[PDB]
Amino acid sequence: GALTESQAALVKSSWEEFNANIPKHTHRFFILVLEIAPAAKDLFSFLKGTSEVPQNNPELQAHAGKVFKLVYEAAIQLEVTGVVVTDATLKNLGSVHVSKGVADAHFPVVKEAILKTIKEVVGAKWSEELNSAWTIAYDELAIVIKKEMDDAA
Numbered sequence: 001g002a003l004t005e006s007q008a009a010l011v012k013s014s015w016e017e018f019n020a021n022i023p024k025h026t027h028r029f030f031i032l033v034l035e036i037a038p039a040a041k042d043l044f045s046f047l048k049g050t051s052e053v054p055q056n057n058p059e060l061q062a063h064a065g066k067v068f069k070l071v072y073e074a075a076i077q078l079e080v081t082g083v084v085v086t087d088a089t090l091k092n093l094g095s096v097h098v099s100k101g102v103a104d105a106h107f108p109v110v111k112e113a114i115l116k117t118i119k120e121v122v123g124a125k126w127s128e129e130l131n132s133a134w135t136i137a138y139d140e141l142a143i144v145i146k147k148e149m150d151d152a153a
């Protein structure tokens with residue numbers, strides 16, 4: 001698909017749609033995560049000692065937001081330039097992931113949780129062309145973070 005002008009127009013549009021609702025889209029995102037893999041709960045400080053996912057914990061929102069931003073930013077950068085650029089941020093990310101005990105078999109957990117989250121986010125507008133555009137952008141970004149964890153470990 002590549003990322004035509006037409007495809008990127010499609011990712012931007014659908015990211016703007018996600019930020020419009022951060023406490024929802026982020027809490028859904030942690031439930032789609034514990035649905036896919038329950039044990040992950042122990043990993044997150046603010047999830048431990050809890051029994052359910054807190055819905056209004058600022059630490060949790062700030063946390064999940066920052067994840068989706070990072071996937072959008074990557075798509076535009078592929079359309080315009082043709083690649084995903086690796087900066088300071090991307091590498092610190094790879095350290096923290098390893099402290100916290102996180103592995104690669106974890107990544108399809110968080111991808112399916114984010115395609116399912118954006119399918120949920122764009123509803124009927126959804127196209128094959130669009131799913132193909134976010135799929136392309138997540139896979140291209142995770143290829144990069146995995147790459148730095150393996151370096152932070």
Ligand code: HEM
Nearest residue numbers: 040043044045063066067070096100102106107110141142
């Ligand atoms: C493209 C994919 C991914 C992106 C963009 C991403 C991004 C981030 C960021 C931005 C932080 C620190 C947030 C803070 O300072 O506020 C972080 C922390 C962390 N990450 Fe991810 N991540 C990805 C995949 C994963 C996966 C697959 C897992 C495993 C389930 C995971 C588990 C964690 C844990 C346990 C922490 C520490 C949270 C704490 O207790 O403070 N991440 N990540």
Ligand SMILES: O=C(O)c1cccnc1
Nearest residue numbers: 044060062063064067110
């Ligand atoms: O909240 C976090 O810190 C988080 C969530 C998903 C993936 N990575 C980090």
